[PDB]
Amino acid sequence: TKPCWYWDKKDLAHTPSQLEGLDPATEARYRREGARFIFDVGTRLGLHYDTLATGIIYFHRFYMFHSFKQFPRYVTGACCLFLAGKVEETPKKCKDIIKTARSLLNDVQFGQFGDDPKEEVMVLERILLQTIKFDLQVEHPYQFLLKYAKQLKGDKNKIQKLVQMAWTFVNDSLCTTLSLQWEPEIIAVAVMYLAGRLCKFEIQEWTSKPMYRRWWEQFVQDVPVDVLEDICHQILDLYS
Amino acid sequence: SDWGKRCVDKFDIIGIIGEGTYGQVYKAKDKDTGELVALKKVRLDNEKEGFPITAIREIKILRQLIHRSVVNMKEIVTDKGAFYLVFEYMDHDLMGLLESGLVHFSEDHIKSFMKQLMEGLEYCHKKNFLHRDIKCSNILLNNSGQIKLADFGLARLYNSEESRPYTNKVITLWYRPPELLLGEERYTPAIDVWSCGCILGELFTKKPIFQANLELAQLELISRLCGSPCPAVWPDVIKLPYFNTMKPKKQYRRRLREEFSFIPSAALDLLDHMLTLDPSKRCTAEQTLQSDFLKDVELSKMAPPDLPHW
Ligand SMILES: CCn1cnc2c(NCc3nc4c(F)c(F)ccc4[nH]3)nc(N3CCCC[C@H]3CCO)nc21
Ligand SMILES: [Mg+2]
């Protein structure tokens, strides 16, 4: 039917970049930087959260097939945002993505674009499309956080706080390979879970089963607590 | 599932079969399987905005549709640069046949074609897609008598939950519904059913039932057969932008049943309902399938038609 876009942690230790000798810490950095660059460029262009996230998902998937040693990260970021704009019906001129990139990056960082920055991005689009296998439609955790939080019945102020915090955690998750490991529905529950923990909220009390501990089972099926914990640890690692 | 990597040179290009929006359509042969295919070219080079947003929309839609009466894209291939969408090759299209003057469709053939077209249309509509380009040249038919709804180049997602604004100038003029001619932008899947009613009528007469060069002339031809648009039949018509501007010549009565009396009664009921002026009163694709004409059509029990092997 459709490609599988999820990998193990063992698989994530064996990306094309590690195979070329890039150490794991440097790759994580390159990914954070590429993701934040897409987020920054896109925000300046008034693109909204779904377009930014789609751009970022294409970026992370691209680097499961290509090495950062062969493909400069910001060029790929710009190219992923450019495509994401068209896919999500919020198009931006390639010229404008370049202009914003020029403004946000230092001279060394912007060196990646070469002499013809726009051409560098356009040429990559063919490769990017082949890499993502023409699987353009992508769903993000945001829509599920909202859909699930809506079904919560309790104190409006606490629920709003849970969501606002959870939303911040989704933005952070995009910096990690979390989208290459777990479906958006699961990331959405994990961010609610992390927010509940930090807020000391009892989310099960906002459900139709106040006595039922595994409040998330009405939203996602058979997701163990250790999976939620693992995701939480990965998000928290960004703050360490 | 690994699309976009296989090369176009794996296909022998026989010849051009169509003009497409973002590239030519070719008949070709698979060098490994010997199967006949159609290749829709997507040109990238010298595009200001690169891979066309238009093709992106089509690709997104095609990948969500799996139905026997709807075109099914096999893979995407690349030049050794353009991309090529790959489809099973279909022996004919409705326009070519109707124009060949080599074919005559029996009531049984029509029922079979309509049953298949509406089942394909219903499937799309249930998936929240508006086709927006239904016409004879976009309906494919094989020698096995199998129909496929094609060309999702103008298709778009539609909000069934709440109304949204859409592009008004969609559908070739001859198949374009009254609400669009009158300037509606928050239209519905009813626009496609109108297009199909035009095909239905055309199958019986072998000529397009509304043939005008311009919008006002088209509205007048529609008015002459279906009656003038007015609140009595279409209350919400007064809310349309061009209602006062575009007004037919006389206030025509509906003479659809007289004009098409030669058509079998059950087909005529369906035609009447499909060519209902008020989109809110026009039958849905699900409703056409429940009509007398189609409800008992058993496809398995139908003989294939006598189509040329041209
Ligand atoms: C969906 C892709 N696809 C797969 N099989 C077909 C197909 N087979 C019928 C056919 N017609 C021909 C023709 F006219 C020729 F000159 C020569 C050969 C022909 N074969 N025809 C068309 N087109 C018919 C009009 C041009 C565009 C598209 C309309 C829909 O995409 N698309 C097709
Ligand atoms: Mg077309």
Question: How is the topology of this model organized?
Answer:
The complex is a heterodimer of chains A (240) and B (310).
Chain A: H1 9-12, H2 16-19, H3 24-44, H4 49-62, H5 73-87, H6 94-104, H7 117-131, H8 141-150, H9 156-173, H10 184-199, H11 225-236
Helix pairs in contact in A: 3-4, 3-5, 3-6, 4-5, 5-6, 5-7, 8-9, 8-10, 9-10, 10-11
Chain B: E1 11-19, E2 24-30, E3 36-42, H1 53-62, E4 73-78, E5 83-88, E6 92-93, H2 94-100, H3 107-126, E7 129-130, E8 139-141, E9 147-149, E10 156-157, H4 178-181, H5 190-205, H6 215-226, H7 256-259, H8 265-274, H9 285-288, H10 292-295
The structure holds the ligand CCn1cnc2c(NCc3nc4c(F)c(F)ccc4[nH]3)nc(N3CCCC[C@H]3CCO)nc21 and magnesium ion.
Family (chain B): Belongs to the protein kinase superfamily. CMGC Ser/Thr protein kinase family. CDC2/CDKX subfamily.
Organism (chain B): Homo sapiens (Human)
Modified residues (Phosphothreonine) (chain B): 167
Descriptive overview:
Chain A has helices at 9-12, 16-19, 24-44, 49-62, 73-87, 94-104, 117-131, 141-150, 156-173, 184-199, 225-236. Chain A has 240 residues and is an all-alpha fold. Chain A folds into 2 domains: 1-137, Cyclin-like (Cyclin A, domain 1), CATH 1.10.472; 138-240, Orthogonal Bundle (Cyclin A, domain 1). The N and C termini of chain A lie far apart (40 Å). The relative contact order of chain A is 0.11. Chain B is α+β, with helices and mostly antiparallel strands and 310 residues long. Helices cover 29% and strands 15% of the residues of chain B. Chain B is built from 10 helices and 10 strands. The two termini of chain B are 35 Å apart. The interface between A and B is medium-sized, with 21 and 19 residues. The complex binds the ligand CCn1cnc2c(NCc3nc4c(F)c(F)ccc4[nH]3)nc(N3CCCC[C@H]3CCO)nc21 and magnesium ion. The ligand CCn1cnc2c(NCc3nc4c(F)c(F)ccc4[nH]3)nc(N3CCCC[C@H]3CCO)nc21 binds at residues 17-18, 25, 27, 38, 71, 87, 89-90, 92-93, 96, 137-138, 140, 150-151 of chain B. Chain A: It is found in: Nucleus.
